[PDB]
């Protein structure tokens, strides 16, 4: 994330780190054995790291659990990143506490103007590259669909929602991908795609989670 | 660069590295005292590093010179990245050899279909972040304008030009910015903007250098 601020130590307990030798994506704990992330962050061998602030140092309040089953959305479109959502089942239930806690699924779709929080260890520079140690945060509204269409003409489906600014040079970036977007105590989006750190003067596009509540539930039931 | 190959040691003698504590962009040597880069790669204090292959190890055939004057194109538009070109005067003439050489300015605009080479120490992963040590290379064609329009509707001006693929997971990325793009022994483009590593299945857009040969010349003459 560019133009954001270092989050308060463990202020985002539902944030996890998808690691495969190195951190590559973010996700969210939805229960003591299931994590939600972006489908494009799929890998055959994934280790989930929870309760972490400084991703490059062992603080003591962390938990590392391997993935036992990774389930992408049947209709995931790698070309248009449509239906860009994936569920991950942990090999062992994680011991929930203050540092490691869940996040609620949307009871409804958040209307335009709603304020949200974006987190992750993505790139923080507009020119060059820099992988922060500490978890970065950014407060950004949920732009109307009209604004979403203007920036990415004819590329927005019903399962996508824009969040960000049109100026100010603040936005999500690669590394933050698959990471949570919480609006009003609920998970409303998943860092999917957009111009990123390079063109911060454009809103980003996220998966519209309020559309998959049924799927998530039925999946968690049958597995 | 993603889905590229590690260039042969010193096979790109015109590639420079804009460093300001850390590598942040690339550029091209056009004479013993001038370098060309992207206007968005503008910084108040830049040190140009020449004759490099392994950006993190001193190899012996290197030269470091400070920027004595940085000239951005008067009409640079930071919002649309139009006229994204900038010139850099070095503090001392560099000693040209086999490892440190120049590259010619376009005698004409390259037509679609032409093959080009893109080099840089930019990001190399589509998920996560990775700054390579060795200079990466990529061979890509110059696409018809039509192909550029479709990807970036109404965002292409007469001063930009598309290069890349529509699939194969190969593309330029942040870090490669301001980086050369040689076609037929001449500099035809400058790494400007595009979806980058995130969505490699999209062509990148570069500055059309063949439109600024006069500007470059008059600028070098007056300074
Ligand atoms: Ca840690
Ligand atoms: Ca070196």
From Swiss-Prot, chains A, B:
Any one GO molecular function term: serine-type endopeptidase activity
Reaction catalysed by this enzyme: Preferential cleavage: Arg-|-Xaa, Lys-|-Xaa
Main subcellular location of this protein, as a coarse class: secreted
InterPro entries xref list: Peptidase_S1_PA, Peptidase_S1_PA_chymotrypsin, Peptidase_S1A, Serine_Proteases_S1, Trypsin_dom, TRYPSIN_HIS, TRYPSIN_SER
Keyword Acetylation: no
Cofactor(s) essential for the protein: Ca(2+)
SMART domains listed in its UniProt record: Tryp_SPc
Binding locations of Ca(2+): 52, 54, 57, 62
One cellular-component annotation, GO: extracellular region
Pfam families: Trypsin (PF00089)
Active-site residues, Swiss-Prot/TrEMBL: 40, 84, 177
Enzyme Commission code: 3.4.21.4
Annotated Peptidase S1 domain residues: 1-221
UniProt-recorded name of the protein: Anionic trypsin-2
Disulfide bonds: 7-137, 25-41, 109-210, 116-183, 148-162, 173-197
Family as reported in the entry's similarity comment: Belongs to the peptidase S1 family.
Subcellular location: Secreted, Extracellular space
Keywords carried by this UniProt record: Calcium, Digestion, Disulfide bond, Hydrolase, Metal-binding, Protease, Secreted, Serine protease, Signal, Zymogen
Organism: Rattus norvegicus (Rat)
Details of cofactor binding: Binds 1 Ca(2+) ion per subunit.
GO process terms (BP): collagen catabolic process; digestion; proteolysis; response to nutrient
């Amino acid at each position: 994330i560019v133009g954001g601020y270092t989050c308060q130590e463990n202020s985002v307990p539902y944030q996890v780190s998808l690691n495969s030798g190195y951190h590559f994506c973010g996700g969210s704990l939805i229960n003591d054995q299931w994590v939600v992330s972006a489908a494009h962050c799929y890998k055959s061998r994934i280790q989930v790291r929870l309760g972490e602030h400084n991703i490059n140092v062992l603080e003591g309040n962390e938990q590392f659990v391997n993935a036992a089953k990774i389930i992408k959305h049947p209709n995931f479109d790698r070309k248009t990143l449509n239906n860009d959502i994936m569920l991950i089942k942990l090999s062992s239930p994680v011991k929930l506490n203050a540092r490691v806690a869940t996040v609620a699924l949307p009871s409804s779709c958040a209307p335009a103007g709603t304020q949200c929080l974006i987190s992750g260890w993505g790139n923080t520079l507009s020119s060059g590259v820099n992988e922060p140690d500490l978890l970065q945060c950014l407060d950004a509204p949920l732009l109307p669909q009209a604004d979403c269409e203007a920036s990415y003409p004819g590329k927005i489906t019903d399962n996508m929602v824009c969040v960000g600014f049109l100026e100010g040079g603040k936005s999500s970036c690669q590394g933050d991908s698959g990471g949570p977007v919480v609006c009003n105590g609920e998970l409303q989006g998943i860092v999917s795609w957009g111009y990123g750190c390079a063109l911060p003067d454009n809103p980003g596009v996220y998966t519209k989670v309020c559309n998959y509540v049924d799927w998530i539930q039925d999946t968690i039931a049958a597995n």
